Design a protein around this ligand. Structure first.
Ligand code: FES
Length: 98
């Protein structure tokens, strides 16, 4: 499968659509399609690439930084997240975490 991922940057007022293989991380596909996004470790072990789901699902089992509550709230580490449906996700959400 190849899923539609809509990237929303709320502070900048942008909406960007990409197509993401079910076996590619969101961050890599965004970059390839011309949308650079924040990151640092690229390994699921920081908060730099955090996003927050609006709709749809991911498999971010490779992640380690987020706690279960944060995941429940919809936070995703985009560097290690595979889409498992069409997704709408807010980017640039690191500052929401504590
Ligand atoms: S860039 Fe560190 S968890 Fe994604």
């Amino acid at each position: 499968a190849t899923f539609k991922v809509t990237l929303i940057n709320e502070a900048e007022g942008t909406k960007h659509e990409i197509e993401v293989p079910d076996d590619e991380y969101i961050l890599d596909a965004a970059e390839e399609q011309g949308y650079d996004l924040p990151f640092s470790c690229r390994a699921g072990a920081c908060s730099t690439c955090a996003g927050k789901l609006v709709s749809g699902t991911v498999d971010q089992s490779d992640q380690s930084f987020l706690d279960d509550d944060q995941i429940e709230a919809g936070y995703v580490l985009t560097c290690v997240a595979y889409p498992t449906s069409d997704v709408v996700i807010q980017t640039h959400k690191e500052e929401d975490l504590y």
